[PDB]
Chain A
Amino acid sequence: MNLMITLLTNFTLATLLVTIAFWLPQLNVYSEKTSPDPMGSARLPFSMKFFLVAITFLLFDLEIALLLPLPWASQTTNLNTMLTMALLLIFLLAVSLAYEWTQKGLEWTE
């Protein structure tokens, strides 16, 4: 409840500062401006490499989601199994990074 009250306070302060920063200079009657970029008007070029770094982020982020209960996993009675699976998860994340390396995937945004 205290969390949600603090979130509502932060959101209300943010929306209030946005509302003030949009409405306070509009009280000025400055001028009605006439005719308000590197490319002229062409389409947005798709870049394959930006998409590849976003997907590589998503896959390593899922592997990180697997890695997150490790500070709780250290407390277990089956420690040999836990240590083996933790080292195996980080090793599969490293094998994913090595395969991403050795197929020229990390190139021109390395």
Chain B
Amino acid sequence: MSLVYMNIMMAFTVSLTGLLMYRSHLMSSLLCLEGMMLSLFILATLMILNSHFTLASMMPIILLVFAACEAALGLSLLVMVSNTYGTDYVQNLNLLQC
């Protein structure tokens, strides 16, 4: 397929596997998730600009708005977790084992 799109998808999959491999923090998970959003923005933008398709120019702005509202929701969840425990560690989030 097309050349720069392979790079943007590869960036998406690297940030996916970063989200799919937790090390320590919930903030690193939100970072990998929003890197996924960034790569989606770049890829949608490059397609819509390449196609000269006019009415989808407003699409990546809406992607950015909805997913940054999503990220605000994730930061508030992380803050409530960190006020419960003291740290935002993912191993403090394991009370639902039983």
Chain A residues with a Cβ under 8 A of chain B: 46, 48, 51, 55, 58-59, 62, 65-66
**B72 contact from A46, A55, A66, Cβ within 8 A:** A55
Chain A residues within an 8 Å CB radius of B71: 58
Query: Would you give the shortest CB distance from B73 to chain A, in whole angstroms?
Result: 9
Whether B65 sits at the interface, judged by CB under 8 Å, is yes
Interface residues on B, range: 10 to 19
List the interface of chain B (C-beta within 8 A of A).
Answer: 61, 64-65, 68-69, 71-72, 75-76, 79, 82-83
Q: How far apart are A61's CB and chain B's nearest CB, in angstroms?
A: 8
B65–A62 CB distance below 8 A = yes
CB proximity of A60 to chain B, nearest CB, Å: 11
> CA of A55 to CA of B69 in the docked complex: distance in angstroms?
9
Q: Using Cβ atoms and an 8 Å threshold, which residues of chain A touch B64? A: 62, 65
Where chain A touches its partner, the secondary structure class is helix
Which chain A residue has the least Cβ–Cβ distance from B73?
A55
A85 → chain B closest CB, angstroms:
12
The smallest C-beta distance from B8 to any residue of chain A, in angstroms, reads 21
The 8 Å CB contact of A46, one of B65, B69, B76, B83, is B83
11 examples of A-B residue contacts, CB within 8 angstroms: A46-B79, A46-B82, A48-B79, A48-B83, A55-B75, A55-B76, A58-B71, A62-B64, A62-B68, A65-B64, A65-B65
The CA of A62 and the CA of B69, in the complex, are separated in Å by 8
Distance A66 CA – B62 CA, assembled complex (angstroms): 8
